[PDB]
Write a protein that binds this ligand. Structure first.
Ligand code: CLA
Ligand code: CLA
Ligand code: CLA
Ligand code: CLA
Ligand code: CLA
Ligand code: CLA
Ligand code: CLA
Ligand code: CLA
Ligand SMILES: CCCCCCCCCCCCCCCC(=O)OC[C@H](COP(=O)(O)OC[C@@H](O)CO)OC(=O)CCCCCCCCCCCCCCC
Ligand SMILES: CC1=C(/C=C/C(C)=C/C=C/C(C)=C/C=C\C=C(C)\C=C\C=C(C)\C=C\C2=C(C)C[C@@H](O)CC2(C)C)C(C)(C)CCC1
Ligand code: SF4
Ligand code: SF4
Ligand code: SF4
Lengths: 740, 144, 73, 80, 39, 165, 73, 63
């Protein structure tokens, strides 16, 4: 029986534990004797599984920790809306979006930092933002700082509610395990309520506020004289003037005469010529369809009535002759293991964040987002990085489950067991695939570099020399482009201009145009295949060999996070699944660094650019095709040439990017100290320093200790990614804001 | 207690096989064979990866190295309270009993066992390397 | 002029590293404490913590101030 | 083969013997400690050099010491 | 309240308060005595 | 004067740099209406720039051919030629503050060491005691000399641990 | 400018010497490994025990010093 | 009853000991002829996390 079950007053609300650091751990509650305790306290703070073996207690901690996260996110959103209402040029940008640069951060005049308040326009001075909030607020139909201020207050009321919910559902009415194990009910509400209702509600706001307000904005009506959203919500005659079908009311909906609502529910495709963004009428009909689809999907799982499906039955039913027992045991694993759920959820959520980056750039959904190159580059790169991090996390929690929640008694001859029984076949085959990709992807760049250096350009792989055209991607582009006339008859235009056709220009800048794919594109798509395949190789290997290997047969007893098994067997350094995540992070960074560099150069070379009389001039003059086929071409025409903006930012508002560019190169080099060294050397050096403190009677009771081996690796990778990603960040923002 | 004789025709736990099993070394150099008695059919974890069902009474498995046999020996003793024994088998038919060497597990002190590699001194009483220099080969002051 | 200076300065750096490497090897393989009792060499070992801690302090000072002044600039 | 040595500081805790994953050590009767037992290393040829025994040794300094030496198929823990 | 004050006496809290105090003091000084290069 | 440098007050490069700096700020002050907040801010930066160039010159700083102030660190040259507020006085100011922090921290560690759980007093700071020592740290220099002269500042070698050698 | 770079050179010389000197003085033993002399100049480590002992040999000190020497030159 | 008194503070003299030149408390002295009968407890843990060790009568001195 699916039902609400909770325990009353489970945990007392006192500050007694606040004053006892490490209270959650049996080992840490004893207090610190060495400095390692401090790190251990912070490193083991959110590892509930290691805190207690009670699943119900762990589940209650997870639920309340999520309410804490939701409260944090709400404060963040309220700040963005507040800074848009009190520290921004949004109202001026609404009147002149093609010239005024969005800005919502103003710095105090101190130690000379006021230089960072650049002349963004609109009689305003501040730091130029690239989050895309101005375009989102314009799409939503916000026309006043009063609306931004009111939403900010709402977000804080919501943040207070989230933090209350967290305290209430942990200290007052804590849900029991049975409650959390209602997966069938959870999916029905998240698909039908959260997703379908959320999409339906948003369609309501778009149809009654976003569409009329933005139609008036695009018609040239001043933001001051546009009717307030409520005026449109309480008057049908105004909405009827803008959309004739509103004069008929909701009769057409219940009479199945949906065709009447064709003026606001449309399938135009392409881009609004005025703004360069997708038609809001298309986004409205889309969210309405999404809402219907997800409302149906949320009525599939069985709850308290006979109708519906049982996920355990469906799984147990899907079994074939080549996979033994099949999906048996998965329902039990995915209803008793949070690490198993986190592994699958992180994998899909990261893959999704990466899909959002591609879809949002090719089909720019917000008005005036396409021609804001700083925002476009920032959005794509940001969501690409978030996706990659989440994908690596998916790997770690899959290994944590394999090490802590895997039970063979429940996994005999099932898909999981059969995968572990042919792990050597899988890793060895993937190993060869990685080596083949490496030589046939990066070897082509070396060939071109050598042929160019040897003065033999005709022997290079290029659109003029030997050609490696991506025919399949060229055919798909042609198919999607011609789709409107045959396979998608109702659609007026193709989904994106990238496929082909005419270019859309707003403010004299190219919003979107067809993107051609040649030998240089074919070469960089195969570098992506190689980098992703290799990253998977490290993460997968770490998960499949987490419990044991031919080198170490009791790795599972050693745990998920352990430095090694000693110098024996030749040396067992970095055999733990955690160490595979450590190595996977570097390859994920290498892959995504190459992906974002590819996007920036391709967009600056073949898409972005000012549209003039009879001709479009791109930012880099179309040099990607003949300069991205060699490593020298990448180093010279991309890194060296586009670094001019960041290296010459001193004395201006982008001066901060120059400082961060140097600071980031520093943090990255500082990581190498931790990544190349070992704690044995540092411990001894500390011993001589401790001697000086002992000599002057200034030695601390908490014994100073070198970082643990695992901590040394964790500190190194953190500073490596921080430094490397920040360096690209400063380079990208300075370059785009200057030549945007 | 007497040195046990390995019966090579013992029933092996139910297992569909894996890719972490024996390699060419088993046919050219040597392999290891663990044997134990089970009072009930229980699924257990193969140190080479995968789940397997131990059979009622006698059970026999072959591993590539001694560490894998001792790893399974640890699981059976700690989790199922069983008492397994393993042997090293050469490709010429020779069998060598290995653990427990005297029938009493090493951690339990047993008579007859003669101390080996024991130094009647503390590590801080070792000589300086200069004293053990120019000996037959590279050696440590500890070896003397 | 450039090639000669860089070449000799890099060869010098490697040789200096080698010198200390062999000094460490000397201590481990040849040093006999009983035959060097009370001598300047044995005295060095007797105040190694002081020597290292002082080299640590100097390095720290130079690092914090030389970096701090460049960053300020 | 790696050189494994036991020192008189041994207290007969048997922890090293329980930690060894290749059965290189065992407990033999002794009269130097209260436990009347001392660790012995009669099967060093099977030692790989994991140094788990040293990690289990609680004496200061270690009573069991491992010196990595000549490498063999067993010392390298090779199943091939 | 005693436990709450003990929590406010924890290393991180005291560090945040002390560093906020020290930073503030330096900022205010440069706010009233701008561009101080020499004594 | 020293090192062939020249007073910033008489350097032509110092004067050109001040004009160059004010001309950048002025080129920007134009695009804005006179009372506009942007205009007020650019004006206050221009006033702060004028005061800095004047205050630095009045302080008698020397300027190199780059037209930028150079600091004299030799105690002898600084005192004899009026350049002690550049490195000398700052040195004794920092040394006092840095020793203040060190002597107070040492006094704290020594006080908490005689307690039941010194480690606990290092993670949870005994605020009242810490505040008391913080105020009593003003006379640290004399206390440090009095400890150096009683032989209570250092520890006996026999009580300090070291490696085998 | 010459003043700042010269202090950077002093930073490198003292740091590289600190690493090399510390390796030679601790080559025969330390508080973490009192019997290091019995293991020789070059050995992988002493295992993860005692908190971890990666790069504890005097050879490991030379290896770390080369990075600082290359940075100095 | 050979050895230092129980509860007394003694300074370690074993060179390879983590508590060399450090003072600990005499937990107990084994009157039986064991090589190291003095059990000493220390407040500071060693690198292995241990806070106790056995020493010979000569390895310890009242301090
Ligand atoms: C005044 C209100 C109050 C009080 C007195 C307590 C008291 C207590 N709670 Mg609790 N809790 C509260 C509110 C409160 N809670 C709220 C609003 C939530 C919802 C998030 C929770 C959720 C919660 C959980 C899940 C758990 C507790 C637990 C506990 C007990 C021990 C843990 C602890 O508090 O140590 C103090 C801990 C902290 C001070 C950490 C603060 C965490 C904040 C939210 C993180 C903020 C990070 C920041 C946003 C970003 C940092 C970035 C960086 C760069 C600075 C303790 C008696 C634990 C328990 O029952 O004992 C085992 C337990 O697991 N609470
Ligand atoms: C219409 C029903 C419904 C809705 C809308 C939600 C919505 C949500 N649930 Mg959920 N859940 C439901 C039913 C529902 N649940 C049922 C029936 C069960 C029992 C099987 C669960 C068990 C469950 C668990 C175990 C967890 C969630 C979590 C979440 C949040 C995930 C964060 C997110 O992606 O959204 C984005 C966030 C927002 C859009 C903010 C808006 C949220 C507001 C408050 C909507 C109201 C939701 C709430 C269910 C309404 C009742 C409140 C009332 C009791 C006062 C999300 C807001 C996760 C969580 O921790 O959340 C704290 C989580 O771990 N739910
Ligand atoms: C969440 C989605 C959503 C929401 C909230 C709305 C809301 C609304 N739509 Mg709408 N619409 C939507 C989606 C949505 N729409 C979609 C997806 C489409 C595309 C098909 C349309 C197409 C559409 C058209 C063509 C029209 C509307 C219209 C309207 C308005 C009138 C509704 C009506 O006629 O009576 C609906 C009946 C109710 C809302 C029931 C009211 C029950 C009340 C609130 C309960 C109060 C109970 C309480 C105890 C009373 C005590 C109070 C207390 C003080 C004591 C209304 C504000 C009409 C309009 O614009 O009017 C100008 C109209 O012409 N919509
Ligand atoms: C929904 C996402 C999610 C969730 C809920 C968790 C939850 C958990 N993870 Mg996990 N993880 C995730 C995503 C997630 N992870 C991703 C995407 C990755 C890939 C990088 C990882 C990689 C990862 C590893 C390798 C490990 C965990 C571990 C854990 C568990 C303990 C966490 C911990 O150690 O506490 C403590 C958390 C901290 C001390 C935070 C450290 C501070 C961060 C890392 C610095 C990041 C830079 C920061 C933004 C800089 C700010 C600016 C600076 C100037 C201040 C815990 C249950 C650990 C575990 O399972 O235990 C065995 C573990 O080893 N995670
Ligand atoms: C007169 C100079 C001199 C002499 C006679 C020696 C003699 C000796 N040294 Mg030594 N050393 C020197 C200078 C010298 N060194 C310098 C300048 C350095 C600093 C770089 C070192 C650093 C050093 C270390 C760290 C060690 C020794 C060791 C030794 C002893 C044995 C090592 C050996 O030779 O095996 C053979 C040596 C080799 C096979 C060379 C290794 C290969 C290196 C990486 C060169 C590869 C470069 C490669 C070709 C580049 C290709 C580029 C191309 C593709 C373009 C030996 C007695 C070892 C020792 O103490 O014994 C235990 C040892 O640990 N030395
Ligand atoms: C850019 C890279 C980099 C940097 C900056 C350093 C820096 C340093 N190394 Mg090092 N090293 C490196 C790479 C690097 N190394 C590499 C690749 C290797 C080979 C693996 C080594 C191997 C090595 C060894 C073997 C040793 C050093 C040592 C040192 C220190 C020498 C003393 C000193 O100069 O103090 C100056 C202090 C600084 C330069 C740090 C600046 C202070 C910070 C930046 C200010 C705080 C910022 C802000 C307030 C807070 C930021 C954090 C925020 C989250 C709150 C020094 C801090 C020696 C040592 O440990 O010293 C005793 C030593 O033994 N290094
Ligand atoms: C060792 C490194 C170092 C040193 C020596 C200095 C020194 C100085 N910096 Mg600086 N800075 C540094 C690193 C350093 N900085 C770094 C790494 C950064 C980047 C984060 C900055 C960023 C920076 C800025 C933005 C500014 C300075 C400024 C200054 C000057 C202001 C002096 C002052 O505050 O008046 C004197 C203050 C006192 C006398 C108070 C003493 C402290 C207590 C309260 C006195 C108690 C006495 C008993 C000063 C000469 C300011 C300046 O105008 O430059 C000329 C300024 O604008 N610095
Ligand atoms: C720490 C390194 C250092 C270095 C490299 C120098 C270098 C120098 N100092 Mg000096 N000085 C130092 C520290 C240092 N000082 C300190 C810590 C103090 C505090 C007492 C002084 C106080 C001082 C005074 C009072 C004078 C100098 C002067 C000089 C210059 C000439 C002094 C001389 O003949 O030999 C180098 C000096 C030293 C190595 C140590 C201290 C300087 C001695 C004690 C002063 C003797 C100067 C003598 C009269 C020669 C100049 C004759 C005439 C022009 C006055 C010279 C460039 C003289 C100068 O040029 O003034 C215009 C001067 O009279 N210094
Ligand atoms: C794609 C693979 C098609 C094969 C496929 O998916 O058929 C599916 C095949 C048939 O499964 P059954 O019908 O027996 O049972 C499936 C049930 O688990 C429910 O679907 O299962 C396999 O045996 C997979 C074979 C291992 C895969 C061998 C090579 C793997 C390819 C590696 C990547 C290549 C690129
Ligand atoms: C009291 C105190 C502490 C200090 C404790 C101890 C023992 C500090 C040790 C000091 C020692 C041993 C110093 C040894 C030698 C120092 C020497 C030879 C002095 C060198 C200074 C020179 C040459 C001056 C240079 C210059 C002067 C005149 C000032 C500036 O103009 C700059 C320059 C370089 C030109 C604790 C506990 C760290 C806590 C805290 C407060
Ligand atoms: S190093 Fe490993 S295999 Fe060798 S004796 Fe010690 S625990 Fe056993
Ligand atoms: S762990 Fe050490 S003290 Fe204990 S039995 Fe083994 S060698 Fe002896
Ligand atoms: S070097 Fe470090 S990680 Fe590698 S085996 Fe030795 S202690 Fe373990």
């Amino acid at each position: 029986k699916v039902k609400i079950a909770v325990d009353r007053n489970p945990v007392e609300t006192s500050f007694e534990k606040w004053a006892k650091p490490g209270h959650f751990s049996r080992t840490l509650s004893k207090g610190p004797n060495t400095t390692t305790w401090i790190w251990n306290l912070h490193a083991d703070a959110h590892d509930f599984d290691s805190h207690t073996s009670d699943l119900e207690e762990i589940s209650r901690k997870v639920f309340s920790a999520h309410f804490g996260q939701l409260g944090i996110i709400f404060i963040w959103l309220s700040g963005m809306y507040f800074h848009g209402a009190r520290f921004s040029n949004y109202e001026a940008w609404l009147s002149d979006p093609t010239h005024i640069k969005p800005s919502a951060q103003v710095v105090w005049p101190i130690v000379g930092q006021e230089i960072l308040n650049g002349d963004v326009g609109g009689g305003f001075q501040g730091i130029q933002i690239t989050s895309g909030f101005f375009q989102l607020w314009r799409a939503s139909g916000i026309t006043s700082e009063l609306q931004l201020y009111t939403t900010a207050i709402g977000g804080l009321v919501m943040a207070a509610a989230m933090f209350f919910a967290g305290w209430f559902h942990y200290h007052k009415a804590a849900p029991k395990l049975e409650w959390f194990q209602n997966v069938e009910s959870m999916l029905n509400h998240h698909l039908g309520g959260l997703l379908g209702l959320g999409s339906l509600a948003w369609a309501g706001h778009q149809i009654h506020v976003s569409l009329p307000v933005n139609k008036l904005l695009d018609a040239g009506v001043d933001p001051k004289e546009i009717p307030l959203p409520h005026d449109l919500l309480l008057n049908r005659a105004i909405m009827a003037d803008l959309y004739p079908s509103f004069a008929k009311g909701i009769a057409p909906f219940f009479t199945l005469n949906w065709s009447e609502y064709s003026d606001f529910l449309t399938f135009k495709g392409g881009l609004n010529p005025v703004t360069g963004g997708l038609w809001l009428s298309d986004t409205a009909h889309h969210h309405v369809a999404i809402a219907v689809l997800f409302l149906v999907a949320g009525h599939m799982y069985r709850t308290n009535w006979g109708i519906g499906h049982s996920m355990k039955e469906i799984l147990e039913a899907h079994r074939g002759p080549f996979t033994g027992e099949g999906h048996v045991g998965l329902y039990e694993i995915l209803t008793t293991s949070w690490h198993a759920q986190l592994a699958i959820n992180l994998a899909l959520f990261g893959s999704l964040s990466i899909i959002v980056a591609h879809h949002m750039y090719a089909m720019p959904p917000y008005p005036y987002l396409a021609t804001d190159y700083g925002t476009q580059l920032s959005l794509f790169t940001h969501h690409t990085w978030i996706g990659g991090f989440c994908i690596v996390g998916a790997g770690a929690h899959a290994a944590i489950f394999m090490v802590r929640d895997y039970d063979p008694t429940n996994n005999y001859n099932n898909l999981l067991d059969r995968v572990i029984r042919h792990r050597d076949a899988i890793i060895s085959h993937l190993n060869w695939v990685c080596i083949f990709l490496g030589f046939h992807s990066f070897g082509l760049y070396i060939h071109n570099d050598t042929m160019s250096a040897l003065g033999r350009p005709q022997d290079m792989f290029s659109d003029t020399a030997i050609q490696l055209q991506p025919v399949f991607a060229q055919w798909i582009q042609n198919t999607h482009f011609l789709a409107p006339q045959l396979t998608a008859p109702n659609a007026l235009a193709a989904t994106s201009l990238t496929w082909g056709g005419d270019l859309v220009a707003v403010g004299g800048k190219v919003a979107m145009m067809p993107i051609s794919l040649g030998t240089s594109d074919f070469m960089v798509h195969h570098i992506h295949a190689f980098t992703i395949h290799v990253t998977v190789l490290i993460l997968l290997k770490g998960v499949l060999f987490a419990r044991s290997s031919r080198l170490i047969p009791d790795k599972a007893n050693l745990g998920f996070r352990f430095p090694c098994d000693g110098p024996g067997r030749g040396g067992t350094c970095q055999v733990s699944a955690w160490d595979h995540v450590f190595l996977g992070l570097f390859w994920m960074y290498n892959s995504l660094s190459i992906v974002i560099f590819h996007f920036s150069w391709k967009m600056q070379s073949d898409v972005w650019g000012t549209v003039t009389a009879s001709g479009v001039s791109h930012i880099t003059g179309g040099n990607f095709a003949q300069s991205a086929n060699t490593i020298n071409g990448w180093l010279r025409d991309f890194l060296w040439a586009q670094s001019s903006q960041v290296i010459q930012s001193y004395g201006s508002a982008l001066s901060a990017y120059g400082l961060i560019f140097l600071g980031a190169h520093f943090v990255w080099a500082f990581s190498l100290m931790f990544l190349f060294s070992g704690r044995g050397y540092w411990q001894e050096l500390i011993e001589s320093i401790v001697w000086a403190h002992n000599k002057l009677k200034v030695a601390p009771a908490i014994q100073p200790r070198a970082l643990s081996i695992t901590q040394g690796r964790a500190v190194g990778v953190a500073h490596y990614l921080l430094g490397g990603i920040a360096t690209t960040w400063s380079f990208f923002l300075a370059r785009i804001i200057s030549v945007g | 207690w007497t040195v046990p004789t390995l019966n090579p025709d013992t029933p092996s736990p139910i297992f569909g096989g894996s890719t972490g099993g024996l390699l060419r070394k088993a046919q050219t150099e040597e392999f290891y064979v663990i044997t134990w008695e089970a009072k009930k059919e229980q699924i257990f974890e193969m140190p080479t990866g995968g789940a397997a069902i131990m059979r009622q009474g006698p059970n026999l498995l072959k591993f590539g190295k001694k560490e894998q046999c001792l790893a399974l020996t640890t699981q059976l003793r700690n989790k199922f309270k069983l008492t397994p024994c393993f042997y090293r088998v050469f490709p010429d038919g020779k069998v060598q009993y290995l653990h427990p060497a005297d029938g009493v597990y090493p951690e339990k002190v047993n008579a007859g066992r003669v101390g080996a590699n024991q130094n009647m001194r503390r590590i801080g009483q070792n000589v300086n390397p200069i004293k053990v220099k120019f000996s037959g080969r590279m050696m440590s002051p500890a070896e003397i | 002029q450039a090639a000669l200076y860089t070449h000799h300065q890099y060869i010098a750096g490697f040789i200096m590293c080698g010198a200390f490497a062999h000094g460490a090897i000397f201590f481990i393989r040849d040093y006999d404490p009983e035959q060097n009792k009370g001598n300047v060499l044995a005295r060095m070992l007797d105040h190694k913590e002081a020597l290292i801690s002082h080299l640590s302090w100097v390095s720290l000072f130079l690092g914090f101030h030389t970096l701090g002044l460049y960053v300020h600039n | 083969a790696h050189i494994v040595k036991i020192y008189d500081t041994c207290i007969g805790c048997t922890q090293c013997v329980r930690a060894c994953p290749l059965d290189v050590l065992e407990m033999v009767p002794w009269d130097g400690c209260k436990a009347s037992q001392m660790a012995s290393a009669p099967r060093t040829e099977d030692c790989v050099g994991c140094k788990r025994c040293e990690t289990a040794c609680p004496t200061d300094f270690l009573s069991v010491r491992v010196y990595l030496g000549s490498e063999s198929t067993r010392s390298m823990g090779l199943s091939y | 309240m005693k436990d709450f004050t003990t929590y406010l006496s924890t290393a991180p809290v005291i560090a945040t308060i002390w560093f906020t105090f020290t930073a503030g003091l330096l900022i205010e000084i440069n706010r009233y005595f701008p561009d101080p290069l020499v004594f | 004067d020293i090192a062939g440098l020249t007073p910033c007050s008489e350097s032509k490069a110092y004067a050109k740099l001040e004009k160059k700096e004010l001309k950048t700020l002025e080129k920007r002050l134009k695009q804005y209406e006179a009372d506009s907040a942007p205009a007020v801010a650019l004006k206050a930066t221009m006033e702060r720039t004028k005061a800095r160039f004047a205050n630095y010159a009045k302080a008698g700083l020397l300027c190199g051919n780059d037209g930028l102030p150079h600091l004299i660190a030799d105690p002898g040259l600084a005192l004899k030629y009026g350049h002690a507020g550049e490195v000398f006085i700052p040195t004794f100011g920092f040394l006092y503050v840095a020793g203040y922090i060190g002597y107070v921290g040492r006094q704290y560690l020594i006080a908490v060491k005689g307690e039941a759980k010194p480690t606990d007093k290092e993670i949870i700071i005994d605020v009242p005691l810490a505040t008391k020592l913080a105020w009593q740290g003003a006379g640290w220099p004399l206390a440090a000399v009095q400890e150096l002269q009683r032989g209570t500042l250092l520890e006996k070698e026999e009580n300090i641990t070291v490696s085998p050698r | 400018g010459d003043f700042l770079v010269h202090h950077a050179i002093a930073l490198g010389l003292h740091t590289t010497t600190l690493i090399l000197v510390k390796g030679a003085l601790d080559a025969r033993g330390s508080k973490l490994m009192p019997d290091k002399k019995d293991f020789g100049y070059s050995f992988p480590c002493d295992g993860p025990g005692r908190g971890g002992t990666c790069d504890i040999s005097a050879y490991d000190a030379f290896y770390l010093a080369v990075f600082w020497m290359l940075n100095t030159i | 009853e050979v050895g230092p008194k129980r509860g007394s503070l003694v300074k370690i003299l074993r060179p390879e000991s983590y508590w060399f030149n450090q003072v600990g408390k005499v937990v107990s002295v084994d009157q039986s002829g064991v090589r190291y009968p003095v059990v000493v407890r220390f407040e500071n843990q060693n690198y292995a996390g241990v806070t106790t060790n056995n020493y010979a009568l000569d390895e310890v001195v009242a301090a």
